[PDB]
Amino acid sequence: CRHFSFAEIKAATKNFDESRVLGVGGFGKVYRGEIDGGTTKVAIRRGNPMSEQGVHEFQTEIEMLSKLRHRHLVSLIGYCEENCEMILVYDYMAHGTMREHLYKTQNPSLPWKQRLEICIGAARGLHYLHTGAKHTIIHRDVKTTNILLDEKWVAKVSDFGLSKTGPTSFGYLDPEYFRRQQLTEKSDVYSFGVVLFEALCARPALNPTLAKEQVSLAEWAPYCYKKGMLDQIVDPYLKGKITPECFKKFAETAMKCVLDQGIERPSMGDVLWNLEFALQLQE
Ligand SMILES: Nc1ncnc2c1ncn2[C@@H]1O[C@H](COP(=O)(O)OP(=O)(O)OP(=O)(O)O)[C@@H](O)[C@H]1O
Ligand SMILES: [Mg+2]
């Protein structure tokens, strides 16, 4: 885990030029930069150290990512705490978030096979979190803005500030958590099921202007599948492009992920295999 001086961060970002801002978020601004004499492109997060939440998320991200390595996780290159600052340095993901290629965007729509491969890549990253670290890691903030795409469209899970480990956003929250008050990796499975319906339906997980039954995609899409009308809320670009057996396998997998009770949901390894099976059924 590399430690950067603050002058390196300032140089990498061209003195935090607004030219290089990729976005703003609760933690702070995210900048595009380059390091190593310009051979490595980076995403640089500048937080606010006066904030308890920011400080807690900063330390959580470092303690988590400093020990993980996986093709489908964004890599932490380093950090800077110099001058009591909170800066995180990541691999740059040139194609942004999964969400920016699904809706409310002028990016072209993604072909179905590409969407399925993005979901498989994200599932492999989550499966690694649940089974490949020293203890189970619960991400706790799985959503389409926290799946990033690199220049070859490889999907990477990002944003670990809320994750939790060790043997103890609105439309993505596991409702069973508000009832059983327990932490389980099945809460990531739930969130990921919502991401799968987003890839298929190309609309927000939560749209608060709709009819009550439609507001939450986690409830609406299973309901439409049972009434034989899921095909009617599928992304218009996808209509006629999914084979019947792929569609059924994909939809049944997503429905199982958003069951009310976590004990009935599949593991991420089971989700991952069913998606790869769905991809074979598409061919
Ligand atoms: N490694 C990266 N490479 C390229 N772009 C990134 C990278 N990490 C973040 N970004 C971009 O930075 C922007 C801000 O991301 P941020 O983490 O603030 O999301 P947020 O939705 O504001 O916060 P949260 O989702 O955790 O509430 C997003 O547009 C995202 O595309
Ligand atoms: Mg995010």
Which 3-state string (H, E, C) describes 124-176? HHHHHHHHCCCCCEECCCCCHHHEEECCCCCEEECCCCCCEECCCCHHHCCCC
**Helix or strand or coil: residue 13?**
coil
Query: Which atom of ligand 1 is nearest to 143's Cα?
Result: 25
* Resolution as reported, in Å: 2.0
HSE (side-chain half, CA atoms, 13 Å) at 186 = 18
DSSP-derived pairing of the beta strands 164-165 and 137-138: antiparallel
Residue type, 86: M
Q: For residue 97, which phi and psi values (nearest 5 degrees)?
A: -95, 155
Distance between CA atoms of residues 97 and 181, nearest Å: 30
Distance between CA atoms of residues 266 and 258, nearest Å: 10
Residue whose CA is at the smallest distance from ligand 1 atom 26: 159
181 torsion bin: left (phi>0), alpha (psi -120 to 50), beta (else):
left
Nearest ligand, CA 29: 1
Tokens of 196: 């799968």
Residue 123 CB contacts under 8 Å (≥ 6 apart), including other chains: 192, 268, 271, 272, 275
Residue whose CA is at the smallest distance from ligand 1 atom 25: 145
141 is known as an active-site residue: yes
Q: Residues, the chain, total?
A: 283
Q: Max Cα separation, the chain?
A: 60
DSSP 266: P
Tell me how crowded residue 115 is: count the other CB atoms within 10 A of its CB.
25
State whether the beta carbon of 74 lies less than 6 angstroms from ligand 1: yes
Break the chain into its structural domains and give their ranges: 22-94, 95-282
The DSSP element (H or E) to which 275 belongs, if any, is helix 268-282
Distance between CA atoms of residues 184 and 167, nearest Å: 11
Out of 76, 98, 101, 145, mutate this one to test ligand 1's pocket (max ligand atoms within 8 Å of CB): namely 145
Tell me how crowded residue 266 is: count the other CB atoms within 10 A of its CB.
17
Positions of chain breaks in the chain, given as the residue before each break (C to N > 2.5 Å): 168
Q: For residue 235, which phi and psi values (nearest 5 degrees)?
A: -45, 130
Q: For tokens 């900063």, name the residue.
A: 58
Nearest ligand, CA 95: 1
Residue 247 CB contacts under 8 Å (≥ 6 apart), including other chains: 231
Distance from the Cα of residue 108 to its chain's centroid: 20
Residue whose CA is at the smallest distance from ligand 1 atom 20: 25
Name the residue among 172, 174, 137, 173 with its Cα closest to residue 63: 137
Centre of ligand 2 to C-alpha 59, Å, is: 17
Tokens of 94: 């040139």
State whether the beta carbon of 144 lies less than 6 angstroms from ligand 1: no
Tokens of 125: 């990253």
State whether the beta carbon of 75 lies less than 6 angstroms from ligand 1: no
**Helix or strand or coil: residue 68?**
coil
DSSP 258: T
Residues lying with their CB under 5 A of ligand 2, a single-atom ion: 145-146, 159
DSSP 109: P
Tokens of 139: 């991400």
DSSP-derived pairing of the beta strands 87-91 and 155-157: unpaired
State whether the beta carbon of 97 lies less than 6 angstroms from ligand 1: yes
DSSP-derived pairing of the beta strands 28-35 and 76-80: unpaired
Tokens of 233: 């809320």
Tell me how crowded residue 139 is: count the other CB atoms within 10 A of its CB.
25
Tell me how crowded residue 33 is: count the other CB atoms within 10 A of its CB.
23
Distance between CA atoms of residues 253 and 77, nearest Å: 35
What sign does the CA torsion over 111, 113, 119, 124 have?
A: negative
Residues facing 149 on adjacent strands: 155
Residue whose CA is at the smallest distance from ligand 1 atom 22: 25
* CA distance to 103, 111, 127, 214, 224, per residue, from 237 (Å): 11, 8, 29, 21, 19
State whether the beta carbon of 61 lies less than 6 angstroms from ligand 1: no
Residue whose CA is at the smallest distance from ligand 1 atom 12: 23
Distance between CA atoms of residues 109 and 234, nearest Å: 13
* CB 198 within 8 Å of CB 104: no
Q: Which of 17, 36, 91, 141 is catalytic?
A: 141
